[PDB]
């Protein structure tokens, strides 16, 4: 398939940890999804790509009612190192970490593997993570650190009927595991309820290290989120703790021209050994 | 130490019927209960390791049933022509050697191995006191490094008692006798397993055998082949 | 002993006094360290391993030792930091009918790798020969079943025996121990340990909607002032406790001694009197 | 034997301060009156040499 893009717009900025504020200015830096950028526009209308996880993944899904269930969370998705499989099955979520490779196809009855070898965690969490021109969409912010796996998830029953796209409008995320799980993961596979016997389309993200001024509400919720590295006028807001800046003139980050190349210079190869005059004799020693 | 008694000569054949008791107990753990016939010159011979299934030999001698606290082993209706000691073993508790009996003399009349595998030893002819000799008791059938031997001792009017046991590669137990200055050293694993003296004491004058298999913890091992001793002759 | 458990049990309060009344052991002598600083010690997993054995042979089970069962079923090398926990199962465990069920591998070629569980079944081969499969003079069992009857004594009985494995990589520790709590105590000065955030104040009732998934709590400038109870859900203010500043009026030492006392910030109820701004 | 060895104490030692002690342990609220019960013993291990 020629994968599409589709730009980005403010949505992704979740609770980077739990402390309650009210009416304040929260200026963190962590991993954050950049406003305006590219995210690909897989559709599901048959797809199942290995993505290459670097340090967070922004998954996206306008499904249905069932169409897009289950991650496929790994590092090499072979049977020497462990993987992930959380899956979600009727009203309930199967969260293991054991080192099933696969079968034929990541597909799903589970059909995804079919082995058996050792396991690590079996956190099977009970309750589930999951009106005719209403459809629902579900986003989930997936970061890895030395030694927990966080999962923020966010579902919200958009309304309008327009082309698919993310739509206009700020919506953080809520925490809902913490599997504190270690293990290296640097591939995401993802999968789709076939079930034979335009659907639906997932929008997959990559986050970065930025810096992100947040508001708080008075109870306590993010209302709305300005990065730091978009414009100027994002730079202007971020150096100040307001989001109303006045008229005038003010100091930002300074700019610098980064280096490109290097150079060594010595003088001038002169002064030859004479070893020339050596290993070219007849009566040479004893 | 256990109860043997010193001799028995009265109604041969009959009802002469030894045993050994001084037990006390209930043979511990496995009853296996063995009888050695220990006779001058050649090395004993195995008579019966269990209370039944006794081994290809003479089958005029079984029926050891454990009575009360002691292995009765019939002997009557044997013959009535023998001249040998007859040793019985128990007390199997976790290291704890002198397992062996006191000589009882069994003679029912008193007037009137070989090829099997190997029989090699040293020949500790005039032994210096002291010093460091080795014997060895080469098998070129049966491997001499994995199965489990062991070397008993035995002096003229004494009884036997464990010297030496070695399991298959991890295990260097001594006997209590010596109590450390003996050092058991394994040659080549190929070729044949030798022994140490390290500075005998002067009580190291016993003869010597050096057996296939265990004496308590007895397997039946196929069959059971003994070699000949040799006097070791102290001059301290 | 040829096949034993290796239960690997993690994400729990491993409560350890708890077993000190669930079954009459009768040896607890835990080598590595003391089991009243055991329970404020968080580790990765644990490794269960259990089996039985006789009562001479619990002596063999050691941090280095040599024996039948020593080095030849189940061995322990010099860093073993769990216990040597055991009971006696001669109550259950010993029927006359013939105990042809377990075995301890009398025949082997040499030591076994510590820590290692060899399942294997076939015919222990003494070398010098090609045993594809025989019982006589050269190859014979490897496996001898126990002697274990009712009417026997002390020594030569069913014993328990199960070792609890301790490891420490790099993984976050998931059983730690049993955590306490004490009674709650409002309007107050005191002290407050709530799960690591440590410090002093007054828990008063406050009227925060505090979101379902944020535990703790700050203000517009870095300070704590508010937590959520780790028992059942209520919201708390953790105010700071009473302090203020405190200045001496003093007419001069030339005329009296009479000196007056003014506290900052307070309202006369938190230490004539009177009460100005 | 000559060399002494000391066990555990419900309490932190102070600095400059002899830790002479002769009694039995007691774990909790359970008196083992002098018999080495269970978590009970005498703080006088001897070191093993070799
Ligand atoms: C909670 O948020 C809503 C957002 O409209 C706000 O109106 C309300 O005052 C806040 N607090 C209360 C009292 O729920
Ligand atoms: C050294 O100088 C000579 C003559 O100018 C030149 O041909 C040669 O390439 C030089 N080598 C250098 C620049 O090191
Ligand atoms: C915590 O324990 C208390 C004990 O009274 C109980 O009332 C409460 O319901 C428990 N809550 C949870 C989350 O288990």
Redesign the interface.
């Known amino acids: 398939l020629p994968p599409a893009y589709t730009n980005s717009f403010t949505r992704g900025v979740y609770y980077p940890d739990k402390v309650f504020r009210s009416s304040v200015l929260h200026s963190t830096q962590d991993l954050f999804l950049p406003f305006f950028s590219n995210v690909t526009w897989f559709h599901v209308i048959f797809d199942n790509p290995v993505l290459p996880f670097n340090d967070g993944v922004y998954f996206a899904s306008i499904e249905k009612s069932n169409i897009i269930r289950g991650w496929i969370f790994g590092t090499t998705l072979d049977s020497k190192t462990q993987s992930l499989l959380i899956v979600n099955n009727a009203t309930n979520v199967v969260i293991k970490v054991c080192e099933f490779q696969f079968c034929n196809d990541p597909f799903l009855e589970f059909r995804v593997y079919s082995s058996a070898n050792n396991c690590t965690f079996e956190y099977v969490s009970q309750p589930f993570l999951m009106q005719g021109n209403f459809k629902n969409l579900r986003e989930f912010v997936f970061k890895n650190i030395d030694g927990y796996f966080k999962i923020y998830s966010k579902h919200t029953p958009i309304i309008v009927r327009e082309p698919e796209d993310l739509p206009q409008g700020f919506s953080a995320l809520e925490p809902l595991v913490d599997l504190p799980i270690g293990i290296n993961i640097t591939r995401f596979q993802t999968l789709l309820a076939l079930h034979r016997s335009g659907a639906a389309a997932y929008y997959v993200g990559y986050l970065q290290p930025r810096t992100f001024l947040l508001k708080y509400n008075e109870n306590g919720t993010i209302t709305d989120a300005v990065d730091c590295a978009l414009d100027p006028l994002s730079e202007t807001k971020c150096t100040l703790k307001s989001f109303t800046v006045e008229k005038g003139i003010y100091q930002t980050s300074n700019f610098r021209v980064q280096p490109t190349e290097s150079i060594v210079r010595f003088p001038n190869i002169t002064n030859l050994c004479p070893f020339d005059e050596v290993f070219n004799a007849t009566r040479f020693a004893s | 130490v256990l109860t043997q008694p010193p001799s028995a000569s009265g109604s041969p054949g009959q009802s002469v019927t030894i045993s050994c008791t001084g037990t006390s107990?209930?043979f511990?753990?496995?009853?296996s209960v063995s009888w050695y016939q220990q006779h001058p010159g050649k090395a004993p011979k195995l008579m019966i390791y269990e209370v039944s299934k006794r081994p290809s030999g003479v089958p005029d001698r079984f029926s050891g049933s454990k009575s009360g606290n002691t292995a009765s082993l019939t002997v009557s209706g044997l013959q009535a022509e023998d001249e040998a000691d007859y040793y019985c073993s128990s007390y199997a508790?976790?290291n704890n050697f002198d397992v062996f009996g006191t000589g009882t003399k069994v003679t029912v009349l008193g007037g009137g191995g070989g090829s099997e595998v190997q029989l090699v030893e040293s020949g500790g002819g005039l032994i210096q006191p002291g010093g460091s000799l080795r014997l060895s008791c080469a098998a070129s059938?049966?491997?001499v490094?994995?199965?489990y031997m062991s070397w008993v001792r035995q002096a003229p009017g004494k009884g036997l008692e464990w010297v030496s046991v070695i399991?298959?590669?991890?295990?260097?137990?001594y006997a209590d006798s010596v109590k450390g200055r003996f050092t058991i050293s394994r040659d080549n694993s190929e070729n044949t397993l030798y022994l140490q003296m390290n500075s005998l004491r002067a009580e190291d004058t016993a003869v010597y055998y050096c057996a296939r298999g265990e004496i308590q913890?007895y397997?039946?091992?196929?069959?059971d082949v003994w070699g000949q001793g040799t006097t070791v002759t102290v001059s301290s | 002993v040829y096949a034993w458990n290796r239960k690997r049990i993690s994400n729990c309060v491993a409560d350890y006094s708890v077993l000190y009344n669930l079954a009459p052991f009768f040896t607890f002598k835990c080598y590595g360290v003391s089991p009243t600083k055991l329970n404020d010690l968080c580790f990765t997993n644990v490794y269960a391993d259990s089996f039985v054995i006789?009562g001479?042979?619990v002596?063999?089970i050691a941090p280095g030792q040599?024996?039948?069962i020593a080095?030849?079923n189940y061995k322990l090398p010099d860093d073993f930091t769990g216990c040597v926990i055991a009971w006696n199962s001669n109550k259950l465990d010993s029927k006359v009918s013939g105990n042809y069920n377990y075995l301890y591998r009398?025949?082997?070629?040499?030591?076994l790798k510590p820590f290692e569980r060899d399942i294997s079944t076939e015919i222990y081969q003494?070398?010098?020969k090609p045993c594809n499969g025989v019982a006589?003079?050269?190859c014979?069992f490897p496996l001898?079943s126990?002697?274990f009857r009712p009417?026997?004594?002390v020594?030569?009985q069913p014993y328990r025996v199960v070792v609890l494995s301790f490891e420490l990589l790099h993984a976050p520790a998931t059983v730690c121990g049993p955590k306490k709590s004490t009674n709650l105590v409002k309007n107050k000065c005191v002290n407050f340990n709530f799960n690591g955030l440590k410090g002093t104040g007054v828990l008063t009732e406050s009227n925060k909607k505090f979101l379902p998934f944020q535990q703790f709590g700050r203000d517009i400038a870095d300070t704590t002032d508010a937590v959520r109870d780790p028992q059942t859900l209520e919201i708390l203010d953790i105010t700071p406790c009473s302090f203020g500043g405190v200045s001496v009026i003093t007419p001069g030492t030339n005329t009296s001694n009479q000196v007056a006392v003014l506290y900052q910030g307070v309202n006369c109820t938190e230490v004539n009197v009177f009460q100005t701004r």
């Open positions: 107990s209930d511990g753990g496995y009853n508790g976790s059938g049966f491997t490094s994995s199965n399991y298959s590669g991890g295990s260097t137990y913890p397997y039946y091992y196929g069959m | 006789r001479d042979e002596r063999q040599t024996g039948n080095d030849y009398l025949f082997r070629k040499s030591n003494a070398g010098n006589g003079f050269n014979y001898r126990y002697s009417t026997y004594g020594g030569h």
